[PDB]
Amino acid sequence: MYQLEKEPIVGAETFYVDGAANRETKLGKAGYVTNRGRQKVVTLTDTTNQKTELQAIYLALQDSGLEVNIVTDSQYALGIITQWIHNWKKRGWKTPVKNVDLVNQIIEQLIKKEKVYLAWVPAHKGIGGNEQVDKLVSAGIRKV
Numbered sequence: 338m339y340q341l342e343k344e345p346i347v348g349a350e351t352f353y354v355d356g357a358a359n360r361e362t363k364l365g366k367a368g369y370v371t372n373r374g375r376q377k378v379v380t381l382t383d384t385t386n387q388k389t390e391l392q393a394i395y396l397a398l399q400d401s402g403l404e405v406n407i408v409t410d411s412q413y414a415l416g417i418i419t420q421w422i423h424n425w426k427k428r429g430w431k432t433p434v435k436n437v438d439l440v441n442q443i444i445e446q447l448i449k450k451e452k453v454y455l456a457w458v459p460a461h462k463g464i465g466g467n468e469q470v471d472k473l474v475s476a477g478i479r480k481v
């Protein structure tokens with residue numbers, strides 16, 4: 338009964354989200370930079386790569402208005418969220434055993450929104466949005 342936008346909401350502020358974790362220490366960071374000049378980065382413990390990407394999306398929804406554009410490089414986070422929206426109650430749908438709690442608070446947050454655009458872009462270089470948030474969350478977590 339909720340449906341993500343097929344194209345970016347024109348006018349809405351865009352959040353370039355990212356996360357990174359290190360597998361030896363389970364330390365990591367999640368955060369965002371936006372096209373209206375606001376950024377946030379938080380440090381986490383006992384986390385994974387997949388967890389930190391979801392965490393980034395969560396702060397995006399946390400800190401944005403009713404219409405938000407979110408660009409992620411995590412096809413996992415996009416898929417697991419999108420699969421939850423689409424299988425909106427099925428007597429034939431088992432729920433994922435991974436990150437169940439995190440994916441559930443995101444859903445809660447996103448049900449509150451009026452319009453969300455969520456899109457995947459591959460990790461890439463340049464001086465664009467995904468590139469700034471990459472190195473912000475990669476700081477002290479991985480070499481890039």
Ligand SMILES: N[C@@H](Cc1ccc(O)c(-c2c(O)c(O)c3c(c2O)C(=O)c2c(cc(O)c(C(=O)O)c2C(=O)O)C3=O)c1)C(=O)O
Nearest residue numbers: 355356357387390409410411412413414460461462471481
């Ligand atoms: N582009 C710069 C920095 C750089 C270098 C080298 C790099 O590898 C990256 C780099 C990132 O900065 C990322 O943020 C991510 C990835 C990166 O590779 C992923 O690869 C990835 C990610 C999320 C996922 O969800 C999946 C998934 O869901 O399957 C995968 C995936 O690999 O499958 C993800 O977020 C970034 C350079 O060229 O040095």
Ligand SMILES: [Mn+2]
Nearest residue numbers: 355356410411
């Ligand atoms: Mn990423």
Ligand SMILES: [Mn+2]
Nearest residue numbers: 355410460471
């Ligand atoms: Mn990245």
Ligand SMILES: [Zn+2]
Nearest residue numbers: 403404451452
């Ligand atoms: Zn509106």
Ligand SMILES: [Zn+2]
Nearest residue numbers: 465466467468
């Ligand atoms: Zn870019």
